[PDB]
Each structure stands twice: as C-alpha cells, then as structure tokens.
Amino acid sequence: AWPKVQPEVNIGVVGHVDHGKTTLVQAITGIWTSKHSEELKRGMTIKLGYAETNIGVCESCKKPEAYVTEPSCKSCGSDDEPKFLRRISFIDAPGHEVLMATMLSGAALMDGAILVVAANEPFPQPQTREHFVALGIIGVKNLIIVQNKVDVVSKEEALSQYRQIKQFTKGTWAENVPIIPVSALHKINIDSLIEGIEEYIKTPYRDLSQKPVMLVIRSFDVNKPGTQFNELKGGVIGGSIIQGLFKVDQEIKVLPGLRVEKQGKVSYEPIFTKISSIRFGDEEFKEAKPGGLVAIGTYLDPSLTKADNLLGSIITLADAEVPVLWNIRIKYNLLERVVGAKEMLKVDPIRAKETLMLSVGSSTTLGIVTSVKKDEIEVELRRPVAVWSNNIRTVISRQIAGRWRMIGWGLVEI
Ligand SMILES: Nc1nc2c(ncn2[C@@H]2O[C@H](COP(=O)(O)OP(=O)(O)O)[C@@H](O)[C@H]2O)c(=O)[nH]1
Ligand SMILES: [Mg+2]
Ligand SMILES: [Mg+2]
Ligand code: NA
C-alpha cells in the first residue's frame, strides 16, 4: 500500500482573479478549499486555501496518463498498483487586487508555483503581472504556467495567447518555463500538469541540521480540509516549516508573542510552550519537516492561540536567539513600474514619513519611514517582527489608489 507521510513540497497556485486557481487545486486534489456561499457574498475568498495529494506513476502505462493522484492505475487502463512518488501540498493564494498582502504571505511558504492564466482573457492581467514579479523577487522560480479554460477558446485563440505568453517570458528568468494547457473545470490534460510538477518542481534539498523555524499561518487565515480532531491537549498552532525539523515534546516559543501593556508602554513578550502533537491532515507524526501545513498541538489555552493579542508569526526552539525589533533597517530596491496597477505608473522614490507595508515571512506589518539614505531605509514598525536570520528578504508595498501595491523589496539588516 501507499505510505502515509507528510507532504514534502509546497506548490503555490497564483494568478489573476477568476482565472481558476481554486478549481485547478480541486482538479489535482479533489478538494475544494473555499466556501462557495461566502465567496458569493464577499465577491472573493480572502483566506489562503490548502490541500494535499499523493503522486504516483503507473510503470506499465505511458506518459503522461501514467501519472496519478490516487493508488489506482484505472485511468490508464491497468490493474497494477502505481509506484508512490511523493506527497505534495498546494497553497491557493488569492488573486483579487485588494489581497496582495495575503498572496505575499502565502508565497513565503512555496517551494514552487503554478501561475494560472485564463485563455479567454487578455494576457497579462494586472495580477498575472504582479504575482509573476512577486514570485521572482521572492525566489519561487520553479514555475509552471498553466493556460486554463481551453475548453472555451478555439485552437487559434489559445495559440495566439500562447505566443503572447512566450513573448512575455522571453528574456526573463522564466524564459524556459513550460506552458501547459488545461481545463481545470473539466479535468482536461491534468496528467500533463502532474508530469510537469514532477519534472519542474523537484523536492528541494533540506539541510535538516539548520535551526528549526516555522512560519505561522493563523487558523482564521487559511481554509484547510476537514479535520477529525481539534486537539484536546490545548490550542493548535499551524504553519509551514521553512528549515530544520520539530519533534514532539520539544520546548518551543511563539514570536514576537503576546501583547503586554504595562504603565503605558507596549511590548510583545515570547510565549514559551511545548509540542504536544504534530499533525498533517488527520495523520499524527512524531516529527515535522519542511513541506506542508503542519498543525503543532501545544499545551496553551485555545483562547490564547486564537487571540488577536497574540502576534504569532514564527515558532522556534525555546533556546533560539531571535531578535524582535520595533525598528528595522532595510537595504532596498524598487521596481521601475507599479506592475499590479491598472494604469501605467512609475514607482515613486521612498519618501521619509510615508507609510509602507512590509511582508516578512508570512507576516504583514505597516511602518513609517523614519530615514531614507541612499539605498537603505529605516522603518519604525507598528508591531515588531521576529528576524530569525540575517538573510531575510522583505517585500515592500505602498498604498496606491486605495490598494496595497508591491513596489519593491529589501534585505532586513541586523
Ligand atoms: N469554462 C471553464 N471555466 C472554468 C475553468 N476553470 C475554472 N472555471 C470557472 O472560472 C471561475 C473562477 O474559478 P476559480 O477556481 O474560483 O478561480 P480563482 O479566483 O482563481 O480561484 C469559476 O466559475 C470556475 O468554474 C475551465 O477550465 N473552463
Ligand atoms: Mg479561489
Ligand atoms: Mg463544462
Ligand atoms: Na479549445
């Protein structure tokens, strides 16, 4: 039989609103991550979507139909059992132009990504643009482009967009990114996408010796498939492990942590706890590693782990030395253009005293610019951030025409 292991790789699913990201995830995994009624009433889904699947291959059958997402070779007409390859998970990021912060939060978790392009819309739409550039800034360059909704366009219409997409990727880091046509709604050519995932999003090397760090995704910020148990021993803290491994009973801390307000002054103090359980889906494990959304069961009271007063951005081992900073210095670069705007706009230079939005790990922090000198800015944050390394790239956004627009990036200097 197929083993029950954690997912070993996170694949983002990005692209413009209504291009079919959530449907594509369902096509691969059988899971519909969002709530249809809420998406109807709000006109968008604001939470990250999450789903997992096994990947196998029917060694008797031919490609790409030999690739399967279940332990059956029926789809290629064989009764042999498929060879298990790996378990993978998907981060379904929002496309709506007001949700760039949530996309950037999800992009911190991706080992690769799929950019979904609708074939019946003019390429490239503003968030096709903005998400593509965001992926390149952040370093998620194991990319597959998917031309979705081919069922509604002619052969000539798909070919014509295909040429637009090749012209767009030409002369960029994505110049050799494959372009796979599919219908997510009717599950057309999904096996070729699976074949592409195996070829172009190989599981990354994990140095399991590094200090364990998990980026936190608050439960109210993500839609995950249904759970059998909500852990009894205390509140659960979910997220994705970006380095090292965590083990049951290890002492850990949640950073920045709990808001404490005493004699006027405000601080965020670390919340120490201990790993009571480790879950992926509804499977229990003794350890957790990078790849997948893990549920870390603690002994904390659920009223703390779900509190808004808890600034839970990362989890580390209890003895890790992690600065928690209200003021940070960023070595920054700006984009030439505001790629995600509808109008053609140049990015203005960073002015002192303006408000910026900083994406660090999975967290989102507003800040004021106290100092601009050359290519370094100094920012006084509204809430501190936990800088777990000296190597951390933040993404910078500015409010433009009543939306948060990605305008550049930087290195957080400590
Ligand atoms: N005709 C057709 N419609 C599709 C296809 N994929 C998605 N859709 C429709 O496009 C709309 C938006 O899809 P959705 O998955 O919610 O897009 P998202 O905003 O990117 O998550 C839905 O009404 C889908 O049923 C497709 O392959 N063909
Ligand atoms: Mg969606
Ligand atoms: Mg149909
Ligand atoms: Na077609």
Q: How far apart are the first and last CA of the chain?
A: 49
Which residues are near ligand 1 (CB < 6 Å)? 17-23, 95, 148-149, 151-152, 183-185
Token pair listed for 345: 């706009």
What is the secondary structure of 186-225 as a DSSP string?
A: TTBSHHHHHHHHHHHSPPPP--TTSPPEEEE--GGGEE--
User: Which residue matches tokens 């074949």?
Assistant: 195
Q: What was the structure determination method? A: X-ray
Cα gap 125→164, rounded to integer Å: 12
Cα–ligand 3 centroid distance for 6 (angstroms): 34
CA atoms of 300 and 381, how far apart (whole Å): 28
Q: Measured from the CA of 152, which atom of ligand 1 is nearest? A: 1
Reported resolution in A? Answer: 2.4
Ligand 1 centroid distance, CA of 375 (Å):
42
Q: Is 319 annotated as a binding residue?
A: no
Question: Which has the closest alpha carbon to 140: 13, 297, 308, 19?
Answer: 13
Kindly state the helix (H) or strand (E) to which residue 29 belongs, with its residue range: helix 21-29
Pinpoint the alpha helices (H) of 119-189: 126-138, 155-169
Distance 154 CA to ligand 4 centre (A): 4
19 annotated among ligand-binding-site residues: yes
Tokens of 6: 């954690």
Domains of the chain with bracketed CATH = 1-206 (3.40.50.300), 207-321 (2.40.30.10), 322-414 (2.40.30.10)
Strand, helix or coil at 93? coil
Of 413, 396, 410, which is closest to residue 104 (Cα–Cα)?
A: 396
Q: Give the pair of three-digit tokens for residue 386.
A: 């936990």
With beta carbons less than 8 A apart as the criterion, state whether 332 and 377 touch. yes
DSSP letter (8 states) at residue 346: B
For 3, 236, 295, 302, the CA distances from 232, given in Å and listed in that order, are 26, 9, 13, 10
Q: How far is CA 326 from CA 6, 333, 383, in A?
A: 36, 21, 6
Q: How far apart are CA 25 and CA 13, in angstroms?
A: 8
DSSP letter, residue 62: P
| DSSP state for residue 303 in the 8-state scheme | H
Smallest CA-to-CA distance from 364 within 218, 211, 214 is with 218
Element housing 140 (H / E): none
Which SS3 state, helix, strand or coil, does residue 36 take? helix
Rg of the chain (C-alpha set)? 22
Give dist(CA 413, CA 331) in Å, integer. 7
186 is annotated as contributing to ligand binding: no
27: buried, middle or exposed (CB in 10 Å: 19+, 13-18, 0-12)? buried
What is the dihedral angle through the alpha carbons of 279, 4, 90, 138, rounded to the nearest 10 degrees? 70
Name residues whose C-beta falls within 8 Å of residue 226's C-beta, 6 or more positions apart in sequence.
Answer: none
Interhelix angle 126-138/100-107, nearest 10 degrees? 30
